[PDB]
Design a protein around this motif. Structure first.
Motif, PDB file in Angstrom:
ATOM      1  N   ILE A  26       0.936  -1.073  -0.044  1.00 19.18           N
ATOM      2  CA  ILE A  26      -0.013   0.017   0.008  1.00 19.18           C
ATOM      3  C   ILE A  26       0.686   1.304  -0.014  1.00 19.18           C
ATOM      4  O   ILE A  26       1.773   1.289   0.729  1.00 19.18           O
ATOM      5  CB  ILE A  26      -1.093  -0.107   1.330  1.00 19.18           C
ATOM      6  N   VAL A  27       0.577   2.085  -0.953  1.00 16.71           N
ATOM      7  CA  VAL A  27       1.064   3.546  -0.852  1.00 16.71           C
ATOM      8  C   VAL A  27       0.209   4.597  -0.406  1.00 16.71           C
ATOM      9  O   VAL A  27      -0.984   4.331  -1.199  1.00 16.71           O
ATOM     10  CB  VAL A  27       1.828   3.715  -2.146  1.00 16.71           C
ATOM     11  N   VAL A  28       0.231   5.466   0.353  1.00 13.46           N
ATOM     12  CA  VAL A  28      -0.430   6.451   0.872  1.00 13.46           C
ATOM     13  C   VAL A  28      -0.023   7.860   0.524  1.00 13.46           C
ATOM     14  O   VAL A  28       1.184   8.050   1.014  1.00 13.46           O
ATOM     15  CB  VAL A  28      -0.545   6.099   2.229  1.00 13.46           C
ATOM     16  N   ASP A  29      -0.900   8.627   0.184  1.00 15.22           N
ATOM     17  CA  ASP A  29      -0.399  10.082  -0.300  1.00 15.22           C
ATOM     18  C   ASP A  29      -1.336  10.903   1.036  1.00 15.22           C
ATOM     19  O   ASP A  29      -2.798  10.905   0.920  1.00 15.22           O
ATOM     20  CB  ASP A  29      -0.941  10.690  -1.373  1.00 15.22           C
ATOM     21  N   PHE A  30      -0.650  11.305   1.994  1.00 17.41           N
ATOM     22  CA  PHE A  30      -1.148  12.311   2.870  1.00 17.41           C
ATOM     23  C   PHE A  30      -1.186  13.807   2.453  1.00 17.41           C
ATOM     24  O   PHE A  30       0.051  14.179   2.199  1.00 17.41           O
ATOM     25  CB  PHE A  30      -0.569  12.220   4.135  1.00 17.41           C
ATOM     26  N   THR A  31      -2.408  14.306   2.220  1.00 14.19           N
ATOM     27  CA  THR A  31      -2.444  15.536   1.516  1.00 14.19           C
ATOM     28  C   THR A  31      -3.377  16.544   2.448  1.00 14.19           C
ATOM     29  O   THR A  31      -3.881  16.346   3.136  1.00 14.19           O
ATOM     30  CB  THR A  31      -2.860  15.263   0.090  1.00 14.19           C
ATOM     31  N   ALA A  32      -3.133  17.700   1.636  1.00 16.16           N
ATOM     32  CA  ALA A  32      -4.051  18.886   2.159  1.00 16.16           C
ATOM     33  C   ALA A  32      -4.399  19.762   1.109  1.00 16.16           C
ATOM     34  O   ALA A  32      -3.938  20.078   0.337  1.00 16.16           O
ATOM     35  CB  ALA A  32      -3.493  19.627   3.369  1.00 16.16           C
ATOM     36  N   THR A  33      -5.908  20.241   1.294  1.00 15.92           N
ATOM     37  CA  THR A  33      -6.314  21.185   0.072  1.00 15.92           C
ATOM     38  C   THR A  33      -5.411  22.659   0.156  1.00 15.92           C
ATOM     39  O   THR A  33      -5.305  23.328  -1.048  1.00 15.92           O
ATOM     40  CB  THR A  33      -7.523  21.622   0.696  1.00 15.92           C
ATOM     41  N   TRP A  34      -4.783  22.789   1.285  1.00 17.18           N
ATOM     42  CA  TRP A  34      -3.990  24.292   1.440  1.00 17.18           C
ATOM     43  C   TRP A  34      -2.495  24.071   0.904  1.00 17.18           C
ATOM     44  O   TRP A  34      -1.742  24.962   0.929  1.00 17.18           O
ATOM     45  CB  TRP A  34      -4.081  24.745   2.628  1.00 17.18           C
ATOM     46  N   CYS A  35      -2.099  22.920   0.649  1.00 16.54           N
ATOM     47  CA  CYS A  35      -0.641  22.500   0.384  1.00 16.54           C
ATOM     48  C   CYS A  35      -0.540  22.478  -1.161  1.00 16.54           C
ATOM     49  O   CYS A  35      -0.976  21.438  -1.855  1.00 16.54           O
ATOM     50  CB  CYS A  35      -0.448  21.061   0.910  1.00 16.54           C
ATOM     51  N   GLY A  36       0.408  23.425  -1.574  1.00 17.81           N
ATOM     52  CA  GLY A  36       0.494  23.835  -2.857  1.00 17.81           C
ATOM     53  C   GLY A  36       1.361  22.655  -3.623  1.00 17.81           C
ATOM     54  O   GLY A  36       0.982  21.900  -4.645  1.00 17.81           O
ATOM     55  N   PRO A  37       2.352  22.185  -3.097  1.00 21.07           N
ATOM     56  CA  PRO A  37       3.195  20.949  -3.744  1.00 21.07           C
ATOM     57  C   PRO A  37       2.309  19.745  -3.647  1.00 21.07           C
ATOM     58  O   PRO A  37       2.516  18.921  -4.786  1.00 21.07           O
ATOM     59  CB  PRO A  37       4.525  21.024  -2.834  1.00 21.07           C
ATOM     60  N   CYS A  38       1.612  19.634  -2.649  1.00 26.71           N
ATOM     61  CA  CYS A  38       0.721  18.406  -2.581  1.00 26.71           C
ATOM     62  C   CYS A  38      -0.270  18.507  -3.965  1.00 26.71           C
ATOM     63  O   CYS A  38      -0.490  17.356  -4.642  1.00 26.71           O
ATOM     64  CB  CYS A  38      -0.299  18.468  -1.371  1.00 26.71           C
TER      65      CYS A  38
END
Length: 111
Positions: A26-38
């Motif tokens: 499993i590979v997981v992307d932890f992300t946020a709407t406010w994170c530009g590089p994400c």
């Protein structure tokens, strides 16, 4: 792509258990709407989910939407990528390097 969106701790636990039963990483992307590089690296994560469909399970966690999972995973900087095997954390990568994300997925698709 075929990225699976995690919406709760219960969903998280079920996906980790699935990867254990199937013997697939499993590979997981932890992300946020406010994170530009994400947001910049999200298209690549989607493309990778297609390229490795059937071989690697791809999950997405919005850290603010599922704060209980972000906290338990110890997230502090984004993007963060985790690899899970047998229900537990096996590898990680923090940062927006596309070459390194590609290499992380390739390593575990071949391991």
């Amino acid at each position: 792509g075929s990225v699976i969106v995690i919406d709760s701790k219960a969903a998280w636990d079920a996906q980790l258990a699935k990867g254990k039963e199937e013997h697939k990483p499993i590979v997981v992307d932890f992300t946020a709407t406010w994170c530009g590089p994400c947001k910049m690296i999200a298209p690549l994560f989607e493309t990778l989910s297609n390229d490795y469909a059937g071989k690697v399970i791809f999950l997405k966690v919005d850290v603010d939407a599922v704060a209980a999972v972000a906290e338990a995973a110890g997230i502090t900087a984004m993007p963060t990528f985790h690899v899970y095997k047998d229900g537990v954390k096996a590898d990680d990568l923090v940062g927006a390097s596309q070459d390194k994300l590609k290499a992380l997925v390739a390593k575990h698709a071949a391991a």
